[PDB]
């Protein structure tokens, strides 16, 4: 449980540990981010087969931190459909021009729910907010995409340019640090605009701010390995170079599979295990 | 016929024997089981489908075409048809339904094939559908074995 | 966003943020309700010019907080708009004295459905109640009155009076603060009460409940922006006197209407930024 | 919450009223599980009136932080109705090699409800998670014991035997506080499992999570109960003995009955209110 490293002294090590440890509570989660600490693994300053190492572990890590931490989605999801549900019911009195036309988007916007993968969970986000921008568009009479294939963008609507300003701000400073939201102290409700458009516009920041989670999610988390096979390549080409009993340890660990991010929790936890016997096969100081 | 294919439940065969003896305004008769040698016979097969497509069918093809009816409003019953294709039995939960489902995005011909292979049951039920008399009986010999009927068809 | 005080220090400043920082978690949610903060302004301690704008950047902040806080029943509202819907279903079943009296409520309940003004909702359920509250009392043959110009005052039948007494202070304790509302252990059905009359009692509940928090809601707002409004009054009569160009400055800043919200959340967002030009004018200790 | 001793040192009594807000927190919540806790109640230092009567206190004090910390299912337990739904979701798409045969699993898998009280829902669980394994075996053709009378038992399918020992490792220190919930236990692997195992073993760690907390509260109550009543009559026998005043109103204190969720909680503020008056009887240091 333990992570080990070679070169470092222990104010560096407990400098990884303390970064790690507040992992969730930075701003700017994302390793790559922080120069600094990648510095911290003393590039140009020790071995290369250290550096390597010690950067591997701090990836290996990371990326547990990532998996330990998880962020869920289990209430904001169903807050979602909660906000969604009143868009109906707010479109049911006013009256349309065609009121098939925005009865069929109603209709998309109440058979609304979440399929259990988290693959399918933004086509909702999406299927949904283009419904109910479009509804609410309808509502104003404002003009409409009528291209084939083509789709109303979702955007906010009747909002100020500082207002969409901050609050992009926000969707934003979302994707750096996803575990964690500070909701704003603007309210999107107008006394100018309509109680749908008031929904609506609260459907899309929902639909937003989960598709924004989301994607950014996914995307370190695909990073990650991709920088853990980055590393096991160059490592095993480093420790064929000057065979012994210890260097001749590691590569027979590193012989196994990068992929399945749990196939990297079984490498990190039998590389510590293991971590005696070959911690003299890396050059420090 | 509905239930040829249920004959491992204790439930089914005890109702299955119900319905198997009427109970008639005279000596009782009961009637032969269709189902035989744990397989249904191809007729009533064939009836049952043509039920059974009738009743499902309809259920996912009707809402394409009452959504659009019920806005006109000159007869003032689809909308609270739209209700009737819910087909739930229980009040609504807090939950899904506000609509009932319908078909997604259907490719623009099937539609028309779905359709005629709905009303292509009916015709294999039609000869279920509707009995028709043959005979009217005006006056009853005694003992009920003569009958003098005025011929109907 | 940074409320600026004349003449109040800082421990002062503190506890009137504080004060609305807390304040989805106080009972008894009403500026006038804690007169404490009202003291805080420097009322009789300081001069009249600060006194009066004190008291105005402390209704601006309040009704600030309450555009933010913004009570939204929706969650409830759904299972108020289910519970009606079986009420009916109860309704048809049941034997009547008179197939053609109770028809009418009958076809009242069929009709209930949410404005796309959120101000109506609380007339619905009012109209909502009176189609059923009566109709109930013809459930168990009761005689109820039909006396011109009352109605049927909306009251819990076949129940407690320990059950009632303490449904009525959740109501009340409800009416005083709308945000934090408190889940019930009671199990509002019997046993011992008429199937239909359990759900004429669950609906009730619900009904009480959004009446409560959309009237106490408008009854506030209501009257904040008629103390806003007093407060320019005030305000610009003080102004007057002074012919500096900051004192001409603070007339033209409170030249704009404080109706509609909107603008007393514009006014105060105006009227923090261009604080430094204009202090000047007010006496400080 | 005004709980009192006859003899004991006042350090003592420290230790015994801090017990009852660290109740919950620490491991072992039981009172036997804890022998100092009784050691500290005053055997051989203080007379045997006083050591049966100061466990009645800490008893029915035990009893009171217990009830305060009223274990409530009802979250996980909708949660549960949640999952086994999406259970039957894939149990109807899954092919099988006999499907009249699971047909039954898939109906008896659709009865599952959970009443108001509490005492049935360890039946209904495992009515249906033997009826899901039995299910989730055929995903994977598991042979199937038909030895009538047998009942196959309820393990996780396809689970590593190192992740079933610290999946059961958090099932054991849940049964052994229920107050207390660690679902950290998230290691199921995206590649090594089939449609239905995956929801079939998340389902059967819900239940055996809600199972484990109805059985350890009723452990609790089921000894806390039989250990006043048996405290109460050996202290009426012991005060026969005596003449005097102070110690004949214990007894009329003590007639009443303990059996009750509520008749210890009216005994203990009854015989706490009442505690300035007979506390002379009782022998002390």
New interface residues.
């Given amino acids: 449980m333990s992570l080990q490293f070679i070169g470092l002294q222990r104010r560096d090590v407990v400098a990884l540990v303390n970064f790690l440890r507040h992992l969730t509570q930075k701003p700017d989660v994302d390793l790559e981010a922080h120069p600094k600490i990648l510095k911290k693994c003393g590039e140009k300053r020790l071995h290369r087969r250290t550096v390597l190492f010690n950067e591997l572990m701090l990836w290996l890590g990371y990326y547990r931190e990532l998996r330990f931490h998880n962020p869920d989605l289990s209430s904001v999801l169903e807050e979602f459909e909660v906000r969604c549900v009143a868009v109906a019911r707010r479109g049911y009195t006013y009256p349309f021009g065609d009121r098939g036309k925005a009865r069929d988007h109603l209709a998309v916007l109440d058979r609304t729910e979440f399929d259990t993968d988290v693959r399918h969970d933004a086509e909702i986000v999406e299927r949904a907010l283009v419904s109910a921008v479009i509804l609410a568009k309808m509502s104003v009479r404002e003009t409409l995409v009528t291209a084939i294939g083509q789709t109303e963008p979702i955007a906010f609507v009747h909002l100020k340019d500082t207002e969409v300003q901050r609050i992009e701000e926000n969707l934003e400073g979302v994707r750096r640090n996803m575990f964690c939201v500070k909701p704003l102290d603007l309210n999107l409700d107008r006394h100018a605009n309509t109680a749908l458009v008031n929904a609506v516009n609260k459907l899309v920041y929902t639909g937003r701010l989960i598709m924004n989670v989301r994607r950014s999610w996914e995307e370190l988390e695909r990073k990650c390995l991709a920088r853990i096979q980055e590393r096991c390549k160059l490592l095993v080409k480093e420790l064929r170079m000057c065979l012994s009993f210890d260097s001749n340890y590691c590569r027979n660990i590193l012989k196994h599979a990068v992929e399945n991010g749990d196939s990297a929790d079984t490498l990190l936890e039998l590389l510590i295990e293991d971590f005696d016997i070959y911690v003299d096969s890396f050059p420090q100081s | 016929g509905l239930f040829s294919l249920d004959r ?1 439940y204790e439930e089914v065969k005890a109702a299955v024997q119900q319905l198997q003896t009427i109970t008639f305004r005279d000596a009782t008769f009961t009637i032969p089981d269709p189902v035989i040698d744990q397989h249904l016979l191809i007729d009533m097969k064939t009836a049952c489908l043509s039920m059974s497509m009738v009743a499902n069918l309809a259920s996912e093809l009707t809402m394409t075409y009452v ?2 009816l019920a ?1 006109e409003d000159s007869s003032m019953l689809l909308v609270k048809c739209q209700e009737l294709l819910m087909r739930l039995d229980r ?4 939950g ?1 339904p ?2 009932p ?2 078909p997604q995005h259907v490719s623009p011909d099937d539609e028309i094939a779905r359709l005629s292979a709905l009303f292509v049951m009916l015709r294999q039920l039609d000869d279920l559908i509707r009995e028709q008399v043959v005979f009217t009986v005006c006056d009853v010999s005694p003992d009920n074995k003569s009958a003098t009927c005025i011929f109907k068809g």
């Fill in positions: 491992s959504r659009k806005l009040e609504r939960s807090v899904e506000r609509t489902a319908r």
